[PDB]
């Protein structure tokens, strides 16, 4: 734990002292070293310690950091996917922004204090406002959308944290507190409602993904959407269970509506990144609802399905970024004959699209089975509703694949050696998790 935190603090530190020509190499080495430190944290985490594997405090309640089942999975996932982001991004400015964002996000996951969680997570507010609103390829509207949505939801969460700190005297997770108030429960809930894109607060995610860089999109999809489940398991369910059980019909209404309308909105997309971004929104609802059941199956299934999403959607975003570099287009209608023109890119694209459709040899299958089993434990109709409307995803995925597959094209647009190096780890991890090493 201490080694992981030290390395997380070391990565932004190194950029200040590097030569500004060695920045990429030093950043890549630092990212791999942080991954190794995360593996060490996993090694030193004994399953005998059932509640929390590790807890460290550095002199205050705010400096209390700890790893649990959800935290450990999410932290390993972010440390796994960061190096790919590092290689995809060029320039000292971009490297600095992405390193600071990753440091803040990775410190948020292991934090055990709601106020420190808020402080670390929202520190990356301007960095995305600048990142998504970059000079030539960015849009100011999307940056405004994401920044305002995050600010309002996080401020509601902050108000609830202040009320808890006033009443209980503490806001740390390790101190058992329960509240039945609905205002505080909604204050904590609204952040989850916005951060995990859930209709009708999902509008920020699409505009952000399309106008963010490929490394930015990879991080956003990979771990920033998963921060919702760390907040839910760590800071909402322990204290706000009475409210989630009181509002369960409403929770199901909103979750299933998000699933259905996000699936239907995906059908109206002509941009590849928008297609992947809307697939993410439909995928988040099952996670949110499975956790909300507050059962052993639901929590495990949600964290598993988060890992599956954080291995599948970064791959699709990376492949789309590679294709956009090769073609300078993201419109499906311009892109044809990709099967003949890019056999190696097409194979991986089809593999990852099959993963997104939750086919058996992929982690999404196991994760979906567990989540659907939890929903079936609550009620049969709950699982039946989700299982049927999964067919909408097949329609748009198949239409996109058919449009890209064949036609007449005069351009060889296939990936280079650097690109294949970029996705090889994701493919290997996807296979390893798919065979059951979840």
């Amino acid at each position: 734990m201490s080694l992981y935190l030290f390395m997380l603090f070391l990565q932004p530190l190194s950029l200040s002292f590097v030569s500004r020509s060695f920045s990429k190499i030093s950043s890549l080495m630092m990212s791999f070293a942080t991954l190794w430190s995360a593996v060490y944290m996993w090694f030193t985490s004994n399953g005998a310690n059932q509640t929390f594997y590790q807890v460290v405090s550095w002199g205050s309640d705010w400096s209390t950091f700890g790893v649990c089942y959800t935290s450990l999975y999410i932290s390993l996932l972010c440390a796994f996917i960061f190096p790919i982001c590092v290689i995809l991004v060029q320039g000292y400015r971009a490297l600095s922004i992405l390193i600071c964002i990753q440091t803040a996000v990775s410190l948020s996951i292991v934090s055990l204090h709601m106020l420190a969680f808020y402080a670390l997570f929202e520190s990356s507010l301007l960095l995305f406002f600048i990142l998504i609103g970059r000079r030539k390829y960015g849009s100011l509207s999307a940056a405004y959308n994401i920044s305002i949505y995050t600010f309002i939801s996080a401020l509601g969460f902050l108000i609830s944290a202040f009320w808890l700190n006033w009443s209980f005297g503490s806001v740390c997770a390790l101190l058992p507190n329960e509240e039945a108030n609905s205002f505080v429960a909604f204050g904590i809930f609204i952040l989850l409602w916005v951060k995990a894109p859930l209709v009708p607060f999902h509008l920020w995610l699409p505009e952000a993904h399309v106008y963010a860089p490929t490394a930015g999109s990879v991080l956003l999809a990979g771990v920033l959407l998963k921060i919702s489940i760390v907040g839910l398991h760590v800071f909402f369910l322990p204290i706000c269970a009475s409210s989630i059980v009181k509002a369960f019909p409403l929770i199901l209404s909103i979750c299933l509506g998000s699933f259905i309308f996000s699936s239907f909105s995906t059908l109206k997309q002509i941009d590849l990144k928008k297609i992947v971004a809307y697939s993410s929104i439909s995928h988040m609802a099952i996670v949110f609802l499975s956790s909300a059941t507050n059962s052993g199956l639901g929590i495990q299934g949600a964290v598993l399905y988060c890992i599956a999403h954080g291995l599948i959607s970064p791959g699709l975003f990376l492949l789309v970024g590679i294709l956009y570099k090769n073609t300078n287009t993201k419109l499906v209608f311009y892109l044809r004959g990709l099967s003949q023109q890019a056999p190696v890119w097409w194979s991986v694209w089809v593999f990852f699209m099959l993963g997104n459709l939750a086919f058996p040899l992929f982690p999404n299958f196991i994760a979906e089975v567990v989540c659907l089993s939890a929903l079936f434990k609550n009620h049969e109709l709950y699982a039946y509703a989700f299982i049927f409307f999964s067919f909408v995803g097949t329609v748009y995925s198949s239409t996109v694949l058919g449009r890209l597959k064949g036609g007449v094209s005069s351009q060889c647009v296939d990936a280079s050696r650097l690109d294949v190096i970029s996705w090889n780890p994701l493919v290997l991890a996807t296979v390893v998790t798919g065979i059951g090493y979840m």
Partner: protein, 205 residues
């Protein structure tokens, strides 16, 4: 819980109850109780009396809005040039119409609220929503298409916000103290006060 095997949170026994224990030995209150005037104005028994007591607020607001607009007009008219028309003949309709229409909207709101509460016999969210819906309907009699929908919704939403954050919110968090021991948890060993803190005196302005 922070584990994937058993449900998060906890449960409290419904059979077992905990005897209330006082937050402090001697209680000193700096919060004054509602005045008799507040109870008089809040009384909705007689809908006419309730309406006539609460309209002066609406008439006042309409008068300020009309005065603002009338002064914006007056400021513009040139003193150096003698004007053939009479300025007050121009300006009085502004203030009078603004005040009258504001008073009419507030009258509909208060009357419908009191009438619904009397007929229903219960204090509920629905009385405010229906009074607001009627007031917003009166607002959008001859207005174009989105406005027949939006104004009933906004005027109905306003009493919901007033009820939610003016009545439900204070009553939900009366017990929470912030000093001594947490309201639910008195078994824990925290410093117990002889007297509650008085951060300010009862106000008198």
């Amino acid at each position: 819980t922070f584990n994937y095997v058993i449900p998060y949170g906890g449960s409290s026994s419904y059979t077992i109850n905990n005897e209330p224990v006082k937050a402090e030995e001697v209680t000193v209150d700096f919060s004054k109780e509602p005045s008799a005037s507040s109870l008089k104005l809040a009384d909705k028994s007689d809908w006419i009396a309730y309406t006539f007591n609460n309209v002066p607020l609406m008439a006042t607001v309409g008068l300020l809005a009309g005065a603002h607009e009338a002064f914006l007009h007056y400021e513009r008219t040139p003193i150096y040039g003698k004007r053939t028309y009479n300025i007050i003949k121009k300006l009085a309709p502004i203030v009078i119409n603004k005040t009258a229409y504001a008073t009419l909207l507030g009258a509909i709101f208060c009357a419908t609220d009191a009438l619904y509460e009397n007929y229903s016999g219960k204090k509920s969210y629905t009385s405010g929503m229906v009074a607001g819906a009627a007031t917003g309907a009166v607002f959008a009699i001859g207005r174009p298409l989105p406005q027949p929908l939006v104004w009933p919704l906004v005027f109905a939403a306003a009493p919901v916000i007033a009820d939610l954050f003016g009545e439900v919110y204070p009553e939900s968090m009366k017990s929470a103290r912030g000093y001594g021991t947490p309201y639910g948890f008195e078994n824990l060993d925290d410093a117990v006060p002889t007297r509650n803190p008085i951060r300010r005196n009862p106000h008198h302005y």
